[PDB]
Design a protein around this ligand. Structure first.
Ligand SMILES: *CC(=O)Nc1ccc2sc3ccccc3c(=O)c2c1
Length: 105
């Protein structure tokens, strides 16, 4: 349903941040270019997501230099562990699926 895909939006949003702090206009078109023009994100959509992650302490926000105000987001410490738990969660279920295709023939 929808909470597999929202579980996938965070894991890639958690990775344009893993590789340098960034703002949204940049994050937005950094995932559009990463998506060959297929994953177009909204400003309002991204913000609600980052607010939740920021409340849960998965990312934090700070300001830039000048000029004009500009909110930047960075991967926090416990956001680093989550990103690799979702990674170690692939390591199991990806061999579990093949072992199930093996326990037949
Ligand atoms: C590090 C790593 O392997 N991370 C990773 C790769 C691919 C996926 S696919 C996916 C799809 C839908 C929801 C979640 C989801 C993942 O957590 C990962 C994680």
């Amino acid at each position: 349903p929808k909470e597999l895909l929202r579980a996938q939006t965070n894991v890639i949003l958690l990775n344009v941040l893993k590789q340098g702090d960034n703002y949204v206009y940049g994050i937005i078109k950094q995932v559009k270019e990463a998506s060959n023009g297929e994953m177009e994100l909204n400003e309002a959509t991204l913000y609600t997501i980052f607010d939740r992650l920021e409340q849960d302490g998965i990312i934090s926000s700070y300001w830039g230099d000048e000029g004009g105000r500009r909110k930047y987001y960075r991967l926090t410490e416990i956001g680093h562990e989550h990103m690799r738990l979702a990674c170690e969660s692939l390591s199991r279920v990806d061999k579990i699926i093949e072992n199930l295709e093996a326990n037949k023939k």
